[PDB]
Amino acid sequence: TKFPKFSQALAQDPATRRIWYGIATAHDLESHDGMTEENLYQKIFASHFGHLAIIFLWTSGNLFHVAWQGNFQQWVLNPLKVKPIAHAIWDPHFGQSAIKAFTRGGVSYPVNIATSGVYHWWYTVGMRTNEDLYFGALGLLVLSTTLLFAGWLHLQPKFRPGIAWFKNNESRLNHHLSGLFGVSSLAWSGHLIHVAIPESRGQHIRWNNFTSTLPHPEGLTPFFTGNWGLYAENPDTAQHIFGTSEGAGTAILTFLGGFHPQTQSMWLTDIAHHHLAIAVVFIFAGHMYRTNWGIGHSMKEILDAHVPPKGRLGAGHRGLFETITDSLHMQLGLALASLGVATSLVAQHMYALPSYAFMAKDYVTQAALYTHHQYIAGFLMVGAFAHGAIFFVRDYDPEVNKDNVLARMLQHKEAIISHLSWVSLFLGFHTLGLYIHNDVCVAFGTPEKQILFEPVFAQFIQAASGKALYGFDVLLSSSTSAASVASSKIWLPGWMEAINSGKNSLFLTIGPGDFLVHHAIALGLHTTTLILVKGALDARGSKLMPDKKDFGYSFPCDGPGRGGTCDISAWDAFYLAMFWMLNTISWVTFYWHWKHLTVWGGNAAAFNESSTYIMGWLRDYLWLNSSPLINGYNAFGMNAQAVWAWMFLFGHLIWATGFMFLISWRGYWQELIETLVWAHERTPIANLVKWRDKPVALSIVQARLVGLAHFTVGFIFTFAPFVIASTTGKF
Amino acid sequence: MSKDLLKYLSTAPVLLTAWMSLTAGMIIEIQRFFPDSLSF
Amino acid sequence: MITDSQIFFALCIALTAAVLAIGLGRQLYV
Amino acid sequence: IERGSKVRVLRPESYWFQECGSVATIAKGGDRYPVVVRFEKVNYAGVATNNFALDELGEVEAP
Amino acid sequence: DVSGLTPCKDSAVFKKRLDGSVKKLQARLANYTEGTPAYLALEQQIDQTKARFAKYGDKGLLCGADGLPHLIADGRPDHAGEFVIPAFGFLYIAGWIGWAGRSYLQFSKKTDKPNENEIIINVPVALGMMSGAFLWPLAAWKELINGQLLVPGDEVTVSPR
Amino acid sequence: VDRSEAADTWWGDKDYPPSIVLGIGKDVPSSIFGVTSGLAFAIGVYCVAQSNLVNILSGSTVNGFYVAGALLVPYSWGLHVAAWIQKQNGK
Amino acid sequence: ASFLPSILTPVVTLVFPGLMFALFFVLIEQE
Amino acid sequence: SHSVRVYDTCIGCTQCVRACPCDVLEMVPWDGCKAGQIASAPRAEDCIGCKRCETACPTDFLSVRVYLGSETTRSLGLTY
Amino acid sequence: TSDVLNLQIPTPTFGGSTGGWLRAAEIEEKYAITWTSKKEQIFEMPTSGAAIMQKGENLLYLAKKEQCLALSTQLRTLFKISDYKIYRIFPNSEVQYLHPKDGVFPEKLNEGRIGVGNVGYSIGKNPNPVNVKFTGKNTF
Numbered sequence A: 001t002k003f004p005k006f007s008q009a010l011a012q013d014p015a016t017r018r019i020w021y022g023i024a025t026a027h028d029l030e031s032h033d034g035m036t037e038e039n040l041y042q043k044i045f046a047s048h049f050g051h052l053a054i055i056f057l058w059t060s061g062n063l064f065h066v067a068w069q070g071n072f073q074q075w076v077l078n079p080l081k082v083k084p085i086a087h088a089i090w091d092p093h094f095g096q097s098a099i100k101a102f103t104r105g106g107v108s109y110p111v112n113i114a115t116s117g118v119y120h121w122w123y124t125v126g127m128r129t130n131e132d133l134y135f136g137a138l139g140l141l142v143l144s145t146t147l148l149f150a151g152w153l154h155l156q157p158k159f160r161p162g163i164a165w166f167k168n169n170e171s172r173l174n175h176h177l178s179g180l181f182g183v184s185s186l187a188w189s190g191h192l193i194h195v196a197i198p199e200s201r202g203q204h205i206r207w208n209n210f211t212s213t214l215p216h217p218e219g220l221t222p223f224f225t226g227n228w229g230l231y232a233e234n235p236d237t238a239q240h241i242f243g244t245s246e247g248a249g250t251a252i253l254t255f256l257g258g259f260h261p262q263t264q265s266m267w268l269t270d271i272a273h274h275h276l277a278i279a280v281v282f283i284f285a286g287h288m289y290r291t292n293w294g295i296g297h298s299m300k301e302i303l304d305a306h307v308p309p310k311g312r313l314g315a316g317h318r319g320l321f322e323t324i325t326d327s328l329h330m331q332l333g334l335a336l337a338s339l340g341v342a343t344s345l346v347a348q349h350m351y352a353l354p355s356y357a358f359m360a361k362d363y364v365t366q367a368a369l370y371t372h373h374q375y376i377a378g379f380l381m382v383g384a385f386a387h388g389a390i391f392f393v394r395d396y397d398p399e400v401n402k403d404n405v406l407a408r409m410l411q412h413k414e415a416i417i418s419h420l421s422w423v424s425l426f427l428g429f430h431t432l433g434l435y436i437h438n439d440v441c442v443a444f445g446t447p448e449k450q451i452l453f454e455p456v457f458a459q460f461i462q463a464a465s466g467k468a469l470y471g472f473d474v475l476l477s478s479s480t481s482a483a484s485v486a487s488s489k490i491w492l493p494g495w496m497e498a499i500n501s502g503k504n505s506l507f508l509t510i511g512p513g514d515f516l517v518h519h520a521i522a523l524g525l526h527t528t529t530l531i532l533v534k535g536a537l538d539a540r541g542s543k544l545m546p547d548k549k550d551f552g553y554s555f556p557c558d559g560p561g562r563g564g565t566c567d568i569s570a571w572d573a574f575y576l577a578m579f580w581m582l583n584t585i586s587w588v589t590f591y592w593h594w595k596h597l598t599v600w601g602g603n604a605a606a607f608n609e610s611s612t613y614i615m616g617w618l619r620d621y622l623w624l625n626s627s628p629l630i631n632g633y634n635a636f637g638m639n640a641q642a643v644w645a646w647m648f649l650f651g652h653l654i655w656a657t658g659f660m661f662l663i664s665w666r667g668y669w670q671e672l673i674e675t676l677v678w679a680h681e682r683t684p685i686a687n688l689v690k691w692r693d694k695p696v697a698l699s700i701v702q703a704r705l706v707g708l709a710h711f712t713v714g715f716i717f718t719f720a721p722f723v724i725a726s727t728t729g730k731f
Numbered sequence B: 001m002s003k004d005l006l007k008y009l010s011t012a013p014v015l016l017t018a019w020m021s022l023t024a025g026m027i028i029e030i031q032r033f034f035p036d037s038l039s040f
Numbered sequence C: 001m002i003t004d005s006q007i008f009f010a011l012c013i014a015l016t017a018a019v020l021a022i023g024l025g026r027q028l029y030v
Numbered sequence D: 001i002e003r004g005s006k007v008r009v010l011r012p013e014s015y016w017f018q019e020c021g022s023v024a025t026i027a028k029g030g031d032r033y034p035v036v037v038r039f040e041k042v043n044y045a046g047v048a049t050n051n052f053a054l055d056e057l058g059e060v061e062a063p
Numbered sequence E: 001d002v003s004g005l006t007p008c009k010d011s012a013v014f015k016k017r018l019d020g021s022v023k024k025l026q027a028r029l030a031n032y033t034e035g036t037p038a039y040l041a042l043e044q045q046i047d048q049t050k051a052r053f054a055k056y057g058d059k060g061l062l063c064g065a066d067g068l069p070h071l072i073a074d075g076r077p078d079h080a081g082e083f084v085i086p087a088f089g090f091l092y093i094a095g096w097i098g099w100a101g102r103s104y105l106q107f108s109k110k111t112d113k114p115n116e117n118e119i120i121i122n123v124p125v126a127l128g129m130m131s132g133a134f135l136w137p138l139a140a141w142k143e144l145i146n147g148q149l150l151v152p153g154d155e156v157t158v159s160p161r
Numbered sequence F: 001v002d003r004s005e006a007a008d009t010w011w012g013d014k015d016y017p018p019s020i021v022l023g024i025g026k027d028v029p030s031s032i033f034g035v036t037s038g039l040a041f042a043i044g045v046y047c048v049a050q051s052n053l054v055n056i057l058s059g060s061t062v063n064g065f066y067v068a069g070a071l072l073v074p075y076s077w078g079l080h081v082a083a084w085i086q087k088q089n090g091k
Numbered sequence G: 001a002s003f004l005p006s007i008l009t010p011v012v013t014l015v016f017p018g019l020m021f022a023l024f025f026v027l028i029e030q031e
Numbered sequence H: 001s002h003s004v005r006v007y008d009t010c011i012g013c014t015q016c017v018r019a020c021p022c023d024v025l026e027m028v029p030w031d032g033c034k035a036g037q038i039a040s041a042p043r044a045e046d047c048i049g050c051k052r053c054e055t056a057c058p059t060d061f062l063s064v065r066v067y068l069g070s071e072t073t074r075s076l077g078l079t080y
Numbered sequence I: 001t002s003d004v005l006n007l008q009i010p011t012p013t014f015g016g017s018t019g020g021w022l023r024a025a026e027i028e029e030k031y032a033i034t035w036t037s038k039k040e041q042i043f044e045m046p047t048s049g050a051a052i053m054q055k056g057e058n059l060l061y062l063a064k065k066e067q068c069l070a071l072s073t074q075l076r077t078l079f080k081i082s083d084y085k086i087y088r089i090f091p092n093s094e095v096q097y098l099h100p101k102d103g104v105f106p107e108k109l110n111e112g113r114i115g116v117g118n119v120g121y122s123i124g125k126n127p128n129p130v131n132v133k134f135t136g137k138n139t140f
């Protein structure tokens, strides 16, 4: 009944580490005392329900706050000038000066200027009044209420799902593909065609009249006759103004491509057609697997048969079905890797192809969103690899994977790790050397000696996609090619203009700075992969510790014997690779932010000139753009960016405090706590007040965790401020 | 220059410094005689 | 303009959700 | 396998796994690992000798 | 020519960069009197700057809008001298280095005291190995064919999987 | 499908897959597989060429029959792999 | 209304979390 | 408390016992080894986990091996 | 030998220190170490300081078995005193004789000792964690 009820070992633990480790292993349900697989799965299911309810509550809170305290209605009239308000500020610590400064956005109270793009998203989606946002918040609140009740219900005795149902892979994948992806995307396309395109074209479609108003003048007669080109006929004109009927068409499903000229975002007809088609594909693919009707596929059979001839990949994929369906960590790793790749994809695609009206001219929101999603992508990738390592050290069965495609990975892990080391070494050596060459050459007053490699291959991709300033004249750039001619009446007439228009972030012009920074990004990705892959492959054992699987995933060490065994557990591989995830995402975000600040400000010949050397990054990006942030508050007064300056210094302080736990280790602090225990016990008066848990220094893995925590939170706070405040102060 | 001093000069760090000295001098002289070669 | 009654109704639904959250936390704790 | 012989170690957990060593002594009865293989490649601890069983060794060259 | 870049010889920005560097040097020349070592050194330096710019103009390097040479590394033989020929030169030199190291290691492993030979290099034979590594591509190919380069993995230490 | 109710389709010890991998077409002969694969390749490539290469696709010209026949080209690949498998299995 | 920030922010961010910290401490110091 | 185990690769060289600063390990008679003795851990509850036994073990891999586990006042080695 | 202590032996002459037991050896468990010396002489306490072990019997109180064993190693390897005995004293005054449990130091084999924590196979033959997943045992 003591705090770690799930772990009787921590229950008998008498020191203060009991509380730390109980909180830390609260959610490590697999290793809890007296745990069975069925109970584990049911608990995971209920926790998923609660988590979904949290997500929808967060969404409803954002919606309600913008409805109640935000200037959504005023912003709708003038999207490009009025600054969106996130929520009102309630702070008794604010002075009169801060009150006047934070009173902004055309309201009489202090407020926070939204940098999440929710205003643009909802305006594009079809929200026009605070009432719609409030009703959305109410409905999401009801949804979360139902999800919480469902989570409670699915732990009851008569309503507790079984392990066979949990492990029913075919039905789950069929339903997720067909309905969760497919029918939900179909629902979104229907929403667009019924509510968003009419609202963009100046029609108020809501629940009271969406049943009466026809999305298309012809109705479903074209859909049933098969003359679906009537839904593309009469597209929106280039003189269309978003939210008004002037210049508005009647088409509901088009493939115009490019961007809407006024809003510089893709056409809602194009997006509706996208979601409709993509759903067709997914609803088809959700009929792949066999579920209670004979017709379909058997995933175990597929994996078993996929073994190439003559044992090229050993025994092929035999046993992989069993390992994946038995081990939740492998499923978690696959999910995290896929979702991290998808997060990187959305980060790369939203800025290049904006979808929300007037987002492109909102420079702060774009940078905030890109940085946000790139960081989360990095975290998801690190988690995918960490859970792969946990699977290897906890759930991997060599008897099942005898001569398997997965076992051969462990078989030639030495080759894999050595070659990842080679490529990381080459990339870092050469990228750093070229950067230093450029640094010294510009330093010595002779920039002509800079070694500047043109990214010819990326430029060739841009030319093949439609760029023409490079003059390569290949594929779509060459109007005559089969690629350019076959698609010349669907999307190219708009895409060509969009890509060759220099006012867009679609396929930005690139140069030697882009070459060098891309090779740096390659170095970051390769080294992070090296650390993570090595951790995963050596989690089971090593020449320095062949029996590591007995110790498990996260243990402090093996002692000073055999030369020392620091950070050998393959959890410390994750903890090391987290630094590199932060490093490479920071490089990515610095590249994005500087190139986009230059492009938005209209001087791309600052990035093209200065980015070739590192002092250009240190001066024309960091030092130059740090002035509006650090000048948030000074001796003469304060501005509305004082919060960003304070949070900038805050992230610096946390990043610095992490170095304490990372550098100084447990013995010093343990002995110091012995001294403090002596003092407290020996002083009078205070010694009547006595602890219950014996105070001890933080454990080794605990302190590694705390130091990495302080590092990461620090990273994100510092760049968030610098990316949100410098953009605001420069535009 | 006994066999012991020849052995000491043959030790690893002395040899590393000597060879890298000759290499750096070679590179620097190639720079003096063929300067500013950002090409072939 | 969101009204006082609207805010109070949303707050009531939020309180119902809170009660359900405590219940779900209990049932996950057992 | 035979004293003075070069033998490849086949113990998976050995530092010298799939590597050669010179046999110096084979004991009588008793020891579950009678053979005493002497190496020249010190492991992490520093020792260059270890006791192995006959099944954990495969001769590559005889005396 | 390619990538939108223009030859550096017909590059207005390149000519202005040359002129600006020349004007900077001549401006700093005012402090020193005629005939002094500093004056003559600056004269040599400005001559070197002009010679460097003329050499870049003559070599056929492509200058971008920034007015600096951009090296085209795509494999076209028009710009082979940028990367392909230096690449071959480095590959030959690095192969020479690695072959000298490997061959000396093969010699030392058979020595009675390989551990001491690792620190104390046998210089008379080290020079021989360094000289003989000039023909490494044929020597490495010969060792590959005879099978004395890649040890069978059934003979390399491997951690418990 | 469960772990138990699943056919023994592993064939790493043998030179060709068992015919059971073909599922519903575990008994259709290699002759039928090959002829259908060839007809499918020809028809599908004809449809693709008529849709996007011989003609230029557009909202007013996209043809459902050509679009559907395009999907016979991957079906043709599957059918030809199937023809080889059945020829090797002796059917 | 504009009443509710004053009523709710301090109740929810001084009183409730202090009570939660008290409850958690008392609970973890049981038995 | 930590779990101390001894495997039959023991050669009875009695160095883990001497490295032991808590009297957890002790030599007992054994038929397997030539020396006729094997290390054993009858007092694992007094184990602290400094792994001096593991450091002093000369086997190619450790005959004496310690797995850290449930912590206690003795295992933490707290004077209070 | 026996689970008993005189609890009146003259202790080493020591001027006091801050390294001793603190409000836990009297509530949870204390430790004692008793030895005999041929001469009255100076030694270093495990707690910081210098003490004078008396001629003949000497008794010392400590808070850790590690502290007692460290003092024992000091006594053996400096003063050649090898008759020390170590006791654990509970708040209920029970005394448990711990270190030279058989009357001889553990490094020398005895005929009566039985093996605790002995595994009949090599270290690299334990079952995988997946085998013991969702079972109360462990891979050793």
Ligand code: CLA
Residues within 6 Å of the ligand: A053, A054, A055, A057, A058, A059, A060, A061, A062, A064, A069, A087, A088, A089, A090, A137, A141, C007, C010, C011, C014, G004, G005, G006, G008, G009, G010, G012, G013
């Ligand atoms: C997670 C979503 C979320 C977030 C981040 C916020 C944030 C905020 N709200 Mg709240 N709020 C939300 C949802 C949310 N709200 C919802 C859905 C409603 C009902 C429609 C309200 C109604 C509301 C009012 C009426 C007021 C605020 C106010 C505030 C501010 C002060 C904090 C406070 O006491 O509010 C909390 C107040 C409540 C009555 C509790 C709401 C309960 C939510 C739904 C819980 C969601 C939990 C989350 C998903 C996960 C757990 C969190 C934590 C336990 C780890 C702050 C900016 C004040 C303001 O405007 O200050 C300037 C204010 O007066 N909010």
Ligand code: CLA
Residues within 6 Å of the ligand: A418, A419, A421, A422, A425, E097, E098, E099, E100, E101, E102, E104, E121, E126, E127, E129, E130
């Ligand atoms: C004897 C020379 C020698 C040779 C033939 C190789 C060969 C190899 N090393 Mg290298 N390596 C060497 C020395 C050598 N190494 C030394 C001294 C170190 C310690 C710094 C390393 C550290 C090292 C690492 C960390 C890695 C390699 C890797 C590799 C492989 C890729 C080649 C590469 O990228 O090299 C990289 C070269 C270096 C990092 C620096 C080399 C140092 C100098 C310049 C050369 C030594 C010459 C020596 C003094 C010659 C004496 C002979 C003379 C007396 C006659 C390859 C098997 C990588 C791998 O495993 O790929 C599969 C890899 O990850 N090596």
Ligand SMILES: CC1=C(/C=C/C(C)=C/C=C/C(C)=C/C=C/C=C(C)/C=C/C=C(C)/C=C/C2=C(C)CCCC2(C)C)C(C)(C)CCC1
Residues within 6 Å of the ligand: A329, A330, A331, A332, A333, A334, A337, A341, A381, A384, A385, A387, A388, A389, A391, A392, A533, A536
């Ligand atoms: C350790 C481990 C693990 C983990 C792992 C991971 C974490 C991974 C990741 C991974 C990743 C993260 C990957 C990625 C991938 C990707 C790819 C592979 C891509 C591809 C692409 C393509 C193919 C494309 C193409 C194209 C198109 C289509 C269009 C345009 C053009 C182009 C050409 C671009 C697991 C769990 C499994 C378990 C076991 C162990």
Ligand code: SF4
Residues within 6 Å of the ligand: H006, H009, H010, H011, H012, H013, H014, H015, H016, H017, H039, H056, H057, H058, H059, H063, H064
């Ligand atoms: S191998 Fe280790 S446990 Fe065995 S006798 Fe030697 S030191 Fe003691």
